[PDB]
Design a protein around this nucleic acid. Structure first.
Lengths: 629, 55, 70, 18, 325
RNA sequence: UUAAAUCCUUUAACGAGGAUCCAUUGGAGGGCAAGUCUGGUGCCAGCAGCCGCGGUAAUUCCAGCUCCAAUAGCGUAUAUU
RNA sequence: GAAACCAAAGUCUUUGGGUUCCGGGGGGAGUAUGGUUGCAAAGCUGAAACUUAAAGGAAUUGACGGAAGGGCACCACCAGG
């Protein structure tokens, strides 16, 4: 830059650019223009009673909203000039915690003084961490309820117990209304962790829900979700997805009066027929003498526990040995491995992505260029403005086709969050998620096992295909989910746009969802080919230099003749290929690069393309509170 | 084209650590380091064997 | 891409399978490699290594001591 | 007859165009 | 057979570049003259040694690779595949002493004959002598076909390979009986006079170099031995070939000659015995050529450090010395 | 003790048998102190300040076991002597 | 003195007779840019970013000569069977 003053002026300009950018982000939240500041509370340990501190937390002005079981409230004060909306969740109740922390702007964790947190709390903590934390603030309760001699050491013992999850964070105690005021102040002025999924879409938390049935006998009618728009500008033409109940097209939006403004009937838009985004999840349009033979003719309760131990041994057989499958001697090997082929090299040798495809692929949607459409959609949300309802506006939504069970469970306690789907998000595709196994569970999980997915705001059961996470075209199928590897789960699911957090759960017993694998959503495409391998073992029992006789790999003669072009390989590293079949039983002469050890094992690799099972249902049962066995 | 990330970490069999008795620490360990080197000396013709030398 | 000025950097991720922890659009603490600005050993034109991902260390994540938030 | 096929390219997913 | 059809072209041609100048070509030189892919050519070489494509040589100081007999054969067929002459392999093979006859089929399905020279001094010189043999044979094959001679039709030549018209029959040495001995005799005697008219003597015009097509048509092959009529002993090689045919038909078919052709006619036919000013587009090309040469020279010196064999030998003795002390 | 406390010091009682009241961080080809041990991987993954290790017996990678250095500290990046 | 060599290239770890210029791994590069001199061609002055484990000097054995001389062999030829 040069020149003392001119060099400094450069720095002065950049300060004014960055300070304006910061002021833009904070005025959007908690105030006269912005919505409220939605704060979720989780007490982590069982000893902690949330009403004990939540009654300190309430006092400004209160507006106690109520449900069946849960009691969440609005807080408003012109002293700090900040609008709040508190929400309280019990850990273990996985269903509620995750579904309303994915809208909550701030999480406030409550912690017991003598221990760190409960095992039940740790379960919910592992989920929140992996589905995406907003802004966390740690709080305690039993600190001032102890003498000064212990009070110093208690906070030190907590810090060591906390470090293993929250590395460096201050703990603010909740005992006095003065202490709680310090906390509110801290929650207001805080660096916001902008969660990527929430920002590109447009969402609502439900403050009040009304049901107008068209026909009560049909048990389907019009919903009236009233709350604040928080994400982007809500467009009526776009579809709307309610979190636990699926996606449905909505009829009408209206903007009534804001029930709680900071300092104290008309419809916004009606949906046209043509501009409307359409509800279509799948594709619409579908001479010899008497006795002589052939040879001479040429001249002329405890059942599941037993199955678990079977799975444990199958996992050991596929961790010690790659994918060693024994050839059947009863059925012909060319028949049992009909659809299998040999690759010269798994990395290089060509395989057509549009070759032999299932009929289930002719029911989904592909992308011509995924990344280009992803850039085009994300630009048309950020750089473009639509005629819809802006953020901060208290609106009411009217949805055309919605079941009674939605309202029924809302009045019980479970919150409704509804987010506007982006373009091409009602359609189905083949979703790919890179996902590592959580150290919590050590249950053997097979490939086409039915699992519970949480692909960011969506919930479903599915049967995935686990794969190698590679950069190449072909991906090798993994028959079991490994404890340390990162793996790609491939499943038919309705197309969502990355980035999105992805969780995997498994229905245990009594209806307990057990977190097995956490990750994220990768690129969504059906062209990503997953390849199942089968390694057939053989035995070299007669060895000459460079050429050897192998048995027990096959049992017929024309089994060897079928897999002639398949290149053999060897445990001790020799690369060969079969020459002649000899016996009527499965014996073969085989050429190699070098001389084989007698201690050796010959083996060929067979490959087929495998596609996932179509087991998509948006309905997933409510889990019971989680506990440790 | 090629490029796995952490291939050899996930392919290796996860062998559990054996349970041995605790090691002595501090002065106690230094005592044991002294007596293993200068006290019970075994005579050798040229000394070619090390401390960890396995075969 | 650094925060404090906006320069682009190629930064080597150390131990095997540590690339899987790092995801696109994440906070990353980068340090030097050791040689004050030389490309260290094998890697060409790479001077920097990743130390932390989203305020937790790669050394911990590899050893399975801590969880990564997102 | 050995490890050779004619496998037709006749059924594919409907692709969204850019 | 040929499955791999990308990097195998560039690596094998790079060997042929070094083969023309030097004996055993080091692996350091190969990657520099095959600059399209860098680093991963060393695993290609390990796939080449699986087949009979290249041979490894680590004698004393010389470390590298040389091209084989069969490896030189694959390179010509790969070039003929791009010229759309060879697609699939026919199995009827007459394995000789100087050359191998391979049946080839094109895109159309029409079967042609392919000649591969197998001359067998180091193997480098043997695979260079086969290059000169095919270029000489194709020169005569073009010269005779244009001048009305009953020879196989020349199609294409690649290094040592010669593609010719498929004339299927039996050589004259293994013929029991001919339906018309006199007409065949007069046909063969005319062809010696025909060559002499063009100023050529066959030299070795025997029953071992003549093929009958359905016992009607005499076909001539093998032409590296041909001499000029300007030679002092021109009539001697002429008369020896005449007497070879004269005796053969009297021996095998018991036909005595009525016509005795001994005419010297040189030459009534063609003598075949001889057989701001600089535009920015150019500036860009010239700058590119300079910048590539600077990078290629630096890559050569990086590859010359591969010595890996020298370090392995030195490490073995040091372990023995420390253990004995 | 102290403004009042806390801590230290001083003291009643309880408080130690190795599955505990369990010591860590780096390393173990050379530089440079300490394994041609065992399994896994097969120029891949990775390591490696530098020299280099890996392309099927890996003293160099991931593990197990064993050992060494420092020790309530010990690594890593950077400025500098 | 690394040495070939050097009565200077000696009187240097037993290091100080006076004094001018000038080098600090190799490249980038004696390049850009500025200044200045030049009718011009150019000269003088003169970087960095970045890249690389080397760039080199002396000496020494002789794997290879597409170097030269000899000598030998019906597993070579010549005259032959």
């Amino acid at each position: 830059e040069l020149s003392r003053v001119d060099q400094r002026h450069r720095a002065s300009q950049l300060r004014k650019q960055k300070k304006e950018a910061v002021l833009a982000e904070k005025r959007q939240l908690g105030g006269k223009d912005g919505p409220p500041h939605q704060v979720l509370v989780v007490p982590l340990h069982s000893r902690i009673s949330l009403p004990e501190a939540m009654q300190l937390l309430q006092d400004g002005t209160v507006h106690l909203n109520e449900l069946g079981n849960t009691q969440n409230f609005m807080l408003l004060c012109p002293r700090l000039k900040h609008r709040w909306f508190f929400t309280s969740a019990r850990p273990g109740d996985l269903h509620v915690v995750l579904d309303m922390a994915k809208v909550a702007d701030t999480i406030l964790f409550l912690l017991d003084p003598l221990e760190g947190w409960d095992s039940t709390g740790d379960y919910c903590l592992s989920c929140l961490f992996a589905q995406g934390l907003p802004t966390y603030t740690l709080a305690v309760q039993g600190i001032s309820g102890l003498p000064l001699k212990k009070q110093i050491d208690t906070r030190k013992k907590l810090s060591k117990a906390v470090e293993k999850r929250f590395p460096h964070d201050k703990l603010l105690l909740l005992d006095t209304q003065q202490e709680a005021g310090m906390l509110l102040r801290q929650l207001a002025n805080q660096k916001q962790q902008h969660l990527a999924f929430r920002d590109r879409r447009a969402y609502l938390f439900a403050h009040a829900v009304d049901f107008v049935p068209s026909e009560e006998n049909n048990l389907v009618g019009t919903l009236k979700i009233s709350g604040y728009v928080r994400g982007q500008t809500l467009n009526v033409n776009r579809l709307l997805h309610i979190v636990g109940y699926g996606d449905f097209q909505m009829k009408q939006i209206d903007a009534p009066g804001d029930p709680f403004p900071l300092n104290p009937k008309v419809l916004m838009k009606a949906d046209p027929g043509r501009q409307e985004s359409l509800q279509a999840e799948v594709i619409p349009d579908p001479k010899v003498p008497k006795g002589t033979s052939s040879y001479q003719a040429e001249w002329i309760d405890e059942e599941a526990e037993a199955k678990m131990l079977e799975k444990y041994k199958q996992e050991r057989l596929e961790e010690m040995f790659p994918d060693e499958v024994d050839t059947p001697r009863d059925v012909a090997a060319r028949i049992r491995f009909q659809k299998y082929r040999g690759l010269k090299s798994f990395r290089t040798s060509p395989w057509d992505p549009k070759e032999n495809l299932p009929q289930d692929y002719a029911r989904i949607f592909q992308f011509q260029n995924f990344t280009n459409t992803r850039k085009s959609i994300f630009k048309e949300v950020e750089e473009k403005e639509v005629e819809g309802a802006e953020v901060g506006w208290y609106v009411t939504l009217h949805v055309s086709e919605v079941p009674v069970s939605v309202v029924e469970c809302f009045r019980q306690g479970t919150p409704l969050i509804a987010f506007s789907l982006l373009p091409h998000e009602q359609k189905m595709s083949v979703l790919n998620m890179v996902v590592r196994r959580d150290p919590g569970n050590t249950e053997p999980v097979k490939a086409k096992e039915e699992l519970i997915f949480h692909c960011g705001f969506r919930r479903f059961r599915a049967s995935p295909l686990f794969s190698q996470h590679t950069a190449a075209d072909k991906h090798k199928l993994q028959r079991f989910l490994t404890a340390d590897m990162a793996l790609v789960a491939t499943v038919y699911a309705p197309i969502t746009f990355p980035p999105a957090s992805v969780l995997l759960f498994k229905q245990k017993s009594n209806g307990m969802h057990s977190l097995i694998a956490t990750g994220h959503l990768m690129s969504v495409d059906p062209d990503r080919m997953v390849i199942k391998r089968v390694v057939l073992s053989g035995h070299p029992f007669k060895i000459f230099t460079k050429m050897a006789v192998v048995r027990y790999m096959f049992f017929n003669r024309e089994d060897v003749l079928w897999f002639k072009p398949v290149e053999l390989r060897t445990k001790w590293g020799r690369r060969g290929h079969i020459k002649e079949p000899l016996g009527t039983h499965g014996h073969m002469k085989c050429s190699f690069d070098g001389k084989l050890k007698s201690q050796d094992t010959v083996l060929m690799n067979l490959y087929k393309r495998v596609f996932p099972k179509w087991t998509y249902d948006p309905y997933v049962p409510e889990p019971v509170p989680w506990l440790k066995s | 084209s090629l490029a796995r990330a952490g291939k050899v970490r996930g392919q290796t069999p996860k062998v559990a650590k054996q349970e041995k008795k605790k090691k002595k620490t501090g002065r106690a360990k230094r005592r044991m380091q002294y007596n293993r080197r200068f006290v019970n000396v075994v005579p050798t013709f040229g000394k070619k064997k090390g401390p960890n030398a396995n075969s | 891409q650094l925060i404090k000025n906006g320069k682009k950097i190629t930064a080597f991720v150390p131990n095997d399978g540590c690339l899987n922890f790092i995801e696109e659009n994440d906070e990353v603490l980068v340090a030097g490699f050791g040689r004050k600005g030389h490309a260290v050993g094998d890697i060409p034109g790479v001077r920097f290594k990743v130390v932390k991902v989203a305020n937790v260390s790669l050394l911990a994540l590899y050893k399975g001591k801590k969880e990564r938030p997102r | 007859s050995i490890c050779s096929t004619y496998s037709n390219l006749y059924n594919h997913p409907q692709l969204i165009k850019y | 057979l040929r499955y791999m059809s990308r990097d195998d072209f560039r690596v094998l041609t790079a060997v042929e570049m070094g083969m023309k100048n030097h004996e055993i070509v080091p692996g350091s030189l190969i990657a520099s003259i095959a600059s399209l892919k860098h680093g991963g050519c060393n695993k290609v070489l390990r796939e080449l040694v699986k087949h009979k494509l290249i041979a490894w040589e680590r004698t004393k100081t010389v470390q590298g690779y040389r091209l084989t007999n069969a490896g030189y054969d694959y390179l010509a067929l790969k070039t003929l595949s791009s010229r759309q002459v060879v697609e699939s392999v026919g199995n009827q093979m007459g394995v000789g002493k100087e050359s191998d006859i391979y049946i080839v089929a094109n895109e159309e399905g029409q079967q042609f004959a392919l000649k591969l020279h197998r001359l067998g001094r180091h193997n480098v010189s043997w695979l260079y002598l086969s290059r000169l043999s095919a270029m000489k044979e194709f020169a005569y094959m073009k010269a005779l076909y244009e001048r009305k001679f009953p020879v196989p039709k020349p199609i294409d030549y690649n290094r040592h390979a010669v593609v010719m018209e498929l004339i299927n029959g039996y050589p004259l040495c293994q013929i029991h009986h001919v339906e018309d001995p006199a007409s065949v005799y007069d046909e063969a005697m005319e062809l010696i006079v025909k060559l002499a008219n063009h100023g050529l003597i066959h030299g070795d015009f025997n029953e071992f170099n003549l093929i009958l097509d359905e016992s009607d048509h005499i076909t001539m092959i093998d032409f590296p031995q041909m001499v000029s009529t300007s030679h002092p002993n021109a009539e001697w090689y002429f008369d020896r070939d005449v007497k070879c045919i004269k005796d053969f038909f009297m021996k095998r078919f018991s036909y005595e000659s009525e016509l005795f052709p001994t005419f010297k006619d040189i030459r009534r036919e063609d003598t075949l015995d001889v057989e701001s000013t600089i535009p920015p587009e150019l500036v860009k090309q010239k700058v590119k050529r300079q910048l590539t040469k600077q990078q290629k020279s630096a890559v050569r010196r990086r590859l010359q450090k591969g010595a890996n064999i020298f370090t392995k030998q030195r490490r073995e003795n040091m372990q023995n010395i420390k253990s004995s002390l």
